[PDB]
Amino acid sequence: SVQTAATSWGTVPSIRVYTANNGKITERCYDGKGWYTGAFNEPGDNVSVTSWLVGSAIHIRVYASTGTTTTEWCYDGNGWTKGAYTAT
Amino acid sequence: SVQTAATSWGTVPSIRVYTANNGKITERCYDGKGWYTGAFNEPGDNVSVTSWLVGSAIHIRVYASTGTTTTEWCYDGNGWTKGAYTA
Amino acid sequence: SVQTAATSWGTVPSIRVYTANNGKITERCYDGKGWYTGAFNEPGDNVSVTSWLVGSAIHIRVYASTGTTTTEWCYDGNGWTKGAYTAT
Numbered sequence: 001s002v003q004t005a006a007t008s009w010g011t012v013p014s015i016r017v018y019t020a021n022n023g024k025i026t027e028r029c030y031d032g033k034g035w036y037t038g039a040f041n042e043p044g045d046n047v048s049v050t051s052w053l054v055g056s057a058i059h060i061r062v063y064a065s066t067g068t069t070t071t072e073w074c075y076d077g078n079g080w081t082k083g084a085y086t087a088t
Numbered sequence: 089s090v091q092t093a094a095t096s097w098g099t100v101p102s103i104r105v106y107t108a109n110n111g112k113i114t115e116r117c118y119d120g121k122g123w124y125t126g127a128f129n130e131p132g133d134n135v136s137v138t139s140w141l142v143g144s145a146i147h148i149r150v151y152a153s154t155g156t157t158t159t160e161w162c163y164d165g166n167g168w169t170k171g172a173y174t175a
Numbered sequence: 176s177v178q179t180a181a182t183s184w185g186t187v188p189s190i191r192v193y194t195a196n197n198g199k200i201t202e203r204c205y206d207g208k209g210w211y212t213g214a215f216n217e218p219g220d221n222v223s224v225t226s227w228l229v230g231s232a233i234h235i236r237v238y239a240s241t242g243t244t245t246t247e248w249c250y251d252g253n254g255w256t257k258g259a260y261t262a263t
């Protein structure tokens with residue numbers, strides 16, 4: 001069994017769908033034409049997601065969890081980086 | 089154990105809550121009065137959801153997953169149809 | 176064996192991350208400074224969440240599920256209360 005998370009933005013629209021399969025999370029993308037594979041590739045058994053626009057710039061936060069460890073991954077216009085999130 | 093997904097829109101507001109129970113996903117709806125059962129009824133062990141408005145017209149996408157198969161279901165103003173999503 | 180759900184709002188932004196661990200759901204909060212522990216503390220094995228603004232006032236709904244029972248929890252400016260949601 002796979003586990004999914006999804007977010008969207010604009011009126012086109014843009015959609016992003018994160019799938020946790022056998023300990024690896026991957027990303028599928030839609031921008032008003034076809035579905036394609038996105039840059040996001042990280043380890044996880046469980047995923048959630050949220051996003052917001054600042055003007056016309058999209059920002060995404062993905063919460064990947066393995067055992068009891070949860071890692072935030074940030075997209076802000078160029079590539080994916082680790083975020084300051086702590087489970088405290 | 090049951091597994092849920094939720095989305096909302098407007099300021100009333102409107103809420104939709106999708107519950108995966110014993111391999112069947114069902115929908116519960118709120119539009120500012122009571123909670124009622126919605127049209128959505130499909131197979132799944134796991135669910136996620138997202139939605140957006142074009143003017144006052146709502147569009148919903150639900151991602152129902154059994155085993156390794158994930159099926160997208162589209163609402164766009166009259167009834168539910170299969171979408172172009174592929175894993 | 177943790178399970179997460181996330182929501183966000185505004186352009187700062189504000190983020191809320193709900194974690195289901197060993198039958199207890201807890202909340203972590205971000206408002207543009209640090210990550211801190213939030214007021215939300217309720218029983219559950221599974222969680223989902225959604226939120227909306229009326230002007231600058233946030234409203235949050237969290238769906239906490241144990242076995243076949245799902246309980247709605249409402250935030251509307253002034254702590255957390257049970258909501259009218261039923262699963263039938």
Ligand SMILES: CO[C@@H]1O[C@@H](C)[C@@H](O)[C@@H](O)[C@@H]1O
Pocket residue numbers: 016027029037038039040058075
């Ligand atoms: C343009 O790059 C694509 O879209 C971004 C918004 C991200 O979802 C990224 O993972 C993907 O590769």
Ligand SMILES: CO[C@@H]1O[C@@H](C)[C@@H](O)[C@@H](O)[C@@H]1O
Pocket residue numbers: 061072074082083084085188205
């Ligand atoms: C600016 O800091 C980055 O983005 C914030 C909105 C948070 O997601 C934080 O954990 C992350 O390090």
Ligand SMILES: CO[C@@H]1O[C@@H](C)[C@@H](O)[C@@H](O)[C@@H]1O
Pocket residue numbers: 104115117125126127128146163
């Ligand atoms: C108008 O129809 C009701 O609201 C729609 C947005 C959908 O949730 C549908 O399944 C439900 O029965």
Ligand SMILES: CO[C@@H]1O[C@@H](C)[C@@H](O)[C@@H](O)[C@@H]1O
Pocket residue numbers: 013030149160162170171172173
């Ligand atoms: C118009 O195409 C339908 O809606 C798009 C926004 C996507 O959900 C796509 O998978 C679906 O087939």
Ligand SMILES: CO[C@@H]1O[C@@H](C)[C@@H](O)[C@@H](O)[C@@H]1O
Pocket residue numbers: 191202204212213214215233250
């Ligand atoms: C101001 O209070 C903080 O923000 C609210 C929106 C809630 O997330 C609450 O549980 C949290 O402690």
Ligand SMILES: CO[C@@H]1O[C@@H](C)[C@@H](O)[C@@H](O)[C@@H]1O
Pocket residue numbers: 101118236247249257258259260
């Ligand atoms: C005022 O009523 C409360 O708020 C609504 C938006 C719903 O979440 C409902 O379950 C709850 O009873």
